[PDB]
Design an enzyme around this catalytic site. Structure first.
Site, PDB file in Angstrom:
ATOM      1  N   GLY D  69       0.797  -1.209   0.000  1.00 33.81           N
ATOM      2  CA  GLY D  69       0.000   0.000   0.000  1.00 33.81           C
ATOM      3  C   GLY D  69       0.833   1.264   0.000  1.00 33.81           C
ATOM      4  N   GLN D  70       2.048   1.178  -0.535  1.00 32.30           N
ATOM      5  CA  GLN D  70       2.914   2.344  -0.614  1.00 32.30           C
ATOM      6  C   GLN D  70       2.352   3.357  -1.606  1.00 32.30           C
TER       7      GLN D  70
END
Ligand SMILES: Nc1nc2c(ncn2[C@@H]2O[C@H](COP(=O)(O)OP(=O)(O)OP(=O)(O)O)[C@@H](O)[C@H]2O)c(=O)[nH]1
Ligand SMILES: [Mg+2]
Lengths: 177, 18, 415, 180
Positions: D69-70
């Site tokens: 989820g960067q």
């Protein structure tokens, strides 16, 4: 041609994936600009067979400066491979990490280099010593910040004469620059 | 046999030198 | 400090490339072919090229030139040694050095290139040791590479313990056109094919002049080798201390020691050749070969190359013993003799035609070369004394050795 | 043509299926994947890249491709949309400020015309703190019922314990396989 190769490389069969990797390697060696398919081969990287992993690493090394943006999807794979029980896989991962000419990739590779610096396997130690020199040549400031000089100095005073010689050569190369 | 001279057995060490 | 190891072809096409440092762009290989062509066409062609700030130092192989680009002040000797090691590894893995294997053995070739050198610094060069980690038809690397002994794999077992040695002699004689010998150097070559069980530590012993003098027996026949070069298995410290040659032989055929000393004895073959070349009319070849070697020795496959005229045609040969053939590809008289008993004397009388029109340019005077190969003959007088085969398990070895005498740089300058 | 081999393979189980692993970083995705594959709570560094694994259950090889989820990896989810048959969304109820970002990311990922046959799979992660909501408040906030032509399923799983994984697997098998 290109579409068929991409479809073969995006399949779930290893028998076709190996053939696609071999064809891609031959095209690059034959003089074919296959850098456009770098993101497609990124998915087919984490494989159990070491035969295709080496080809993928070689393609990434040869296609690292061409597509530095697309190379951001390989740090996790290198980190995962830097802890495999097999010394050959770890050595190959260490060699490939230092060969990647990416300014945004060497920053996150400091931890694997530090972990492999004190590796018990002499081959792993030699690979880490070579990768330290490669990173220092690529970025001297990053190497100085990581404090690899102290680890390199202690390498000469340890066992594994091949690893000691490799560390001495890396230190001489670093001091040359 | 063999061209270039037949193979000959070699000794173990200088027996006359102790 | 090579930047990228690449393999070209006879048409300038790079068969395979392996970047090591990446400091040189891959497009510089294109100018290597024109630069080599310019250097060769002007007499400035050298194995070490220079494309501006990048130097392309490489040697020519059987079918392709292994040119390795470099940019810094790297060791040219180190690059040459790495190229020689790579060539030896390829020869061990591939029986032939041609383009047919470069395009067919790329899968193993790339792996071997990646494993051999990293960042321009080679780490492993033993073909036998490397064959256990990289195969074309992978487990953990063997402990031999990590261990000090990198030339003898542990755990090797054989039904018998037989080692065949080869005392190969190279007779090099440089006879000037005046009839005197200028350079007469004989280089010994002790090649052994070690095939034993375990990791025996061979202790080679011979009647060396230095060893005989040190032991106090400097009165018998001792070989005075000016240069003695031991292999990687031979321990330098042991030889430096008391001339002790103690080393672990490898599994297979390898070069252990190579003696090299000057020779002050008369040539084993005396060649008396005459050239009665008439001015564009005819020519005579009064070649007489006298064997100065021992009569008990026979020179198998005697090949005395006699350089005949380049434009000579319609030749007639009047010889005594041996087959004399003129090869148009080589443009010389091949004095081929099957067996030459020691002390034999062969007389030849050449007679060939010559065109009336003179040649446009000079061709030089190629030297006459003899290809005598007489086995079971030791001119230097060096004889093997002992070979201490010691194993921890304990076994009775059966070492073997053969002495072969051949003609090395045995070229005779023409008149 | 003959399909005797296919019938023989299906008599003992032939279908495998696929699955996807997407969600925000620190959402329990790596821990959930480790629990599904091995069955232990493994602590790992943040997923810079992605994790690929497979789960064998009910004679179906559920291959899971974890996606981080960067921020720099949020737009990289389109690479896995090709040749993708399943998709599992992991919510983070412990981050009130990140709930809006997760909902926006899910809406953006659901606005692709190529990923239309992938049914919704909402996993209630971080089901160990009292601040976590129920299985309907999160769905109501995200408006999962307003996804026309989308089959969504909300399931709450505890990372420390692992309860509810069997129910979610059964629901996924029932949604994917429409046979006895
Ligand atoms: N103690 C505890 N921590 C949890 C629990 N559920 C989620 N977490 C947190 O969520 C994180 C999950 O990280 P991972 O499972 O390794 O991988 P991830 O969920 O994809 O997170 P990223 O790697 O950052 O993308 C952990 O570091 C925990 O801090 C839980 O049930 N108990
Ligand atoms: Mg994760």
């Amino acid at each position: 041609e290109i579409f068929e190769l991409k479809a073969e490389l995006n399949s779930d069969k290893k028998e076709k994936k190996k053939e696609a990797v071999k064809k891609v390697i031959a095209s690059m060696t034959v003089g074919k600009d296959v850098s456009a398919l770098f993101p497609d081969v990124v998915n087919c990287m984490q494989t159990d067979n070491l035969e295709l992993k080496k080809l993928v690493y070689l393609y990434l090394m040869n296609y690292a400066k061409s597509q530095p943006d697309m190379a951001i999807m390989a740090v996790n794979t290198f980190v995962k491979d830097c802890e495999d029980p097999n010394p050959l896989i770890r050595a190959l991962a260490v060699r490939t990490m230092g060969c990647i000419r990416v300014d945004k990739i060497t920053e996150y590779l400091c931890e694997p280099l530090r972990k492999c610096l004190k590796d018990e396997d002499p081959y792993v130690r030699k690979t880490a010593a070579v990768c330290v020199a490669k990173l220092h040549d690529i970025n001297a400031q990053l190497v100085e910040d990581q404090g690899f000089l102290d680890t390199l100095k202690d390498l000469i005073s340890d066992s594994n004469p091949m690893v000691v010689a490799n560390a001495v050569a890396a230190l001489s190369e670093i001091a040359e620059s | 046999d063999r061209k270039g001279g037949s193979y000959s057995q070699a000794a173990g060490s200088d027996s006359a030198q102790s | 400090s090579a930047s990228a190891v690449y393999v070209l072809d006879l048409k300038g096409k790079v068969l395979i490339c392996r970047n090591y440092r990446g400091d040189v762009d891959m497009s510089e290989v294109e100018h290597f072919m024109p630069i080599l062509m310019e250097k060769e066409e002007e007499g400035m062609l050298s194995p070490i090229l220079a494309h501006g700030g990048v130097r392309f130092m490489w040697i020519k192989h059987n079918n392709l030139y292994l040119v390795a680009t470099s940019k810094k002040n790297a060791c040219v000797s180190l690059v040459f040694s790495f190229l020689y090691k790579v060539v030896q590894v390829f020869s061990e893995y591939f029986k032939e050095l041609e383009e047919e294997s470069i395009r067919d053995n790329f899968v193993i070739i790339y792996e071997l290139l990646d494993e051999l050198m990293d960042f321009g610094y080679p780490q492993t060069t033993d073909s036998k040791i490397l064959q256990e980690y990289i195969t074309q038809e992978a487990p953990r690397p063997p402990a031999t590479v990590t261990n000090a002994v990198s030339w003898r794999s542990e755990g090797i077992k054989y039904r018998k313990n037989e080692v065949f040695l080869d005392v190969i002699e190279a007779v090099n004689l440089l006879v000037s056109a005046n009839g005197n010998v200028l350079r007469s150097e004989i280089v010994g070559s002790i090649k052994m094919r070690v095939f034993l069980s375990g990791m025996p530590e061979l202790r080679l012993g011979l009647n060396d002049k230095v060893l005989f003098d040190n032991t106090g027996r400097g009165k018998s026949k001792s070989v005075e080798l000016e240069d003695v070069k031991f292999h990687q298995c031979v321990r330098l410290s042991r030889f430096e201390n008391d001339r002790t040659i103690s080393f672990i032989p490898p599994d297979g055929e390898f070069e252990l020691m190579s003696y090299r000393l000057n020779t002050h004895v008369k040539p084993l073959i005396w060649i008396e050749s005459v050239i009665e070349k008439h001015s564009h009319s005819r020519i005579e070849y009064m070649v007489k070969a006298k064997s100065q070697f021992k009569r008990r020795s026979t020179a198998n496959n005697v090949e005395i190359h006699i350089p005949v005229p380049n434009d000579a045609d319609s030749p007639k040969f009047k010889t005594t013993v041996g087959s004399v053939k003129w090869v148009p590809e080589n443009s010389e008289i091949v004095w081929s003799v099957k067996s030459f008993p020691g002390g034999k004397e062969y007389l030849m009388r050449a007679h060939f035609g010559l065109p009336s029109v003179e040649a446009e340019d000079k061709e030089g005077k190629p030297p006459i070369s003899v290809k005598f190969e007489i086995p079971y003959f030791t001119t230097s007088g060096i004889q093997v004394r002992y070979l201490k085969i010691i194993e921890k398990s304990g076994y009775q070895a059966l070492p073997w050795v053969r002495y072969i005498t051949q003609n090395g740089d045995y070229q005779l300058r023409t008149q | 043509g003959n399909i005797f081999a296919n019938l023989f393979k299906g008599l003992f189980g032939k279908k495998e299926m696929r699955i996807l692993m997407v969600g925000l970083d620190a959402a329990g995705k790596t821990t959930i994947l480790y629990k599904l594959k091995l069955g232990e709570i493994v602590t790992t560094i943040p997923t810079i890249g992605f994790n690929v694994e497979t789960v064998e259950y009910k004679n179906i090889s559920f291959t899971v491709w974890d996606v981080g989820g960067q921020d720099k990896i949020r737009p990289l989810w389109r690479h896995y949309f090709q040749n993708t048959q399943g998709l599992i969304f992991v919510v983070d109820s412990n981050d009130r400020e990140r709930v809006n970002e997760a909902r926006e990311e899910l809406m953006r990922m659901l606005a692709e015309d190529e990923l239309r046959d992938a049914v919704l799979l909402v996993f209630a992660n971080k089901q160990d703190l009292p601040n976590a909501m129920n299985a309907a408040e999160i769905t109501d906030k995200l408006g999962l019922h307003s996804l026309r032509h989308r089959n969504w399923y909300i399931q709450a799983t505890c990372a420390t314990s692992g309860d509810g994984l069997y129910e979610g697997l059964d629901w996924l098998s029932n949604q994917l396989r429409n046979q006895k």
